[PDB]
Ligand binder design. Structure first.
Ligand SMILES: Nc1ncnc2c1ncn2[C@@H]1O[C@H](CSCC[C@H](N)C(=O)O)[C@@H](O)[C@H]1O
Ligand SMILES: CCCCCCCCCC[N+](C)(C)CCCCCCCCCC
Length: 283
């Protein structure tokens, strides 16, 4: 199984400078958690991180594996607030380099590693696992392999917090009393073709199946559905105000595409065609 470096890199290696125009300072690129009403995006992203890490029963000395570490905000938070060693995986060249600098400049004593590789090329024992918004890039065809590896790399009391967007079947969506449909399907095509090449959304039962079939017990499924529309609204508001900057670094063609993507997804979550859930997978 050769990781899909090309497709994944197609999106995230666009330009850190560009993503910085709409993501919060920690560069977290996933659904935030507005635990409190007046939280800033940065505070809500940290709260999301704590929500995920707080389910792992972390302890000093442990080694945490972050599958699809992104720009590393989660890894560094794990080190700094929870005092654990970390290992981060990503197919993005720019992310690997960025996190490599965070590691190089850290004054914390814990072990920190970032690899430009996929879980498909990682076979090392870890104490706990966290994966936020990376699953959507694996593809239905590799779900079983992922959980197999996850279960194999974890200790006896191991735990994996899998956070991923989930979707309903377009055919069955019509019964949910949800109009549009065609519009939804047409937008999904747009996303997979111009935003996330190779992307694929898993249904909740699909995650529950691959987990159980590989020896895991899903002890909790928490939805952050409403929180994503706001996260996306905040991302789009910033990008738009940074429009002039967006075109300079790239092109107005890229800008238009990203605004269409950010805003569109926001409505999709608002109406309920898509969801986002954190699965506590207990070994
Ligand atoms: N097969 C695979 N193995 C490892 N990382 C993968 C992957 N497919 C996608 N990813 C990574 O998952 C991330 C999406 C999201 C970023 C972070 N978890 C927050 O913020 C990217 O960093 C991407 O490179
Ligand atoms: C139906 C095809 C779905 C492909 C989904 C690809 C998802 C990539 C998610 C990447 N992160 C975690 C960085 C988040 C980006 C913002 C939310 C995007 C939601 C897309 C929903 C498409 C239905």
């Amino acid at each position: 199984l050769k990781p899909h470096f090309a497709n994944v890199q197609a999106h995230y290696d666009l330009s850190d400078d560009f993503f910085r125009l709409f993501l919060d300072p920690t560069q977290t690129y996933s659904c935030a958690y507005f635990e409190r009403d007046d939280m800033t995006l940065q505070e809500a992203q940290i709260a999301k991180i704590d929500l995920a890490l707080g389910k792992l029963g972390l302890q000093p000395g442990m080694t945490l594996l972050d599958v699809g570490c992104g720009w590393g905000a989660t890894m560094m938070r794990a080190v700094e607030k929870y005092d654990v060693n970390v290992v981060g995986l990503t197919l993005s060249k720019n992310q690997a380099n960025h996190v490599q600098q965070l590691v190089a400049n850290s004054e914390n004593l814990r072990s920190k590693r970032v690899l430009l590789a996929g879980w498909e090329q990682f076979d090392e024992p870890v104490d706990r696992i966290v994966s936020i918004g990376a699953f959507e890039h694996f593809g239905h065809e590799r779900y079983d392999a992922f959980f197999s590896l996850a279960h194999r790399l974890l200790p006896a009391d191991g735990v994996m917090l899998l956070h991923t967007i989930t979707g309903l079947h377009p055919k069955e969506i019509h019964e949910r009393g949800l109009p549009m449909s065609f519009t939804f399907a047409r937008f999904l095509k747009f996303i997979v073709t111009e935003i996330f090449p190779g992307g694929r959304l898993p249904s909740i039962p699909m995650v529950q199946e691959c987990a159980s079939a590989n020896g895991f017990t899903v002890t909790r499924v928490q939805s952050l559905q409403p929180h994503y529309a706001k996260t996306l609204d905040l991302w789009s508001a910033a990008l738009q105000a940074n429009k002039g900057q967006a075109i300079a670094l790239q092109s107005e063609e890229v800008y238009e595409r990203y605004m269409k993507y950010l805003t569109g997804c926001a409505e999709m979550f608002r109406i309920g065609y898509i969801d986002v859930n954190q699965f506590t997978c207990q070994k």
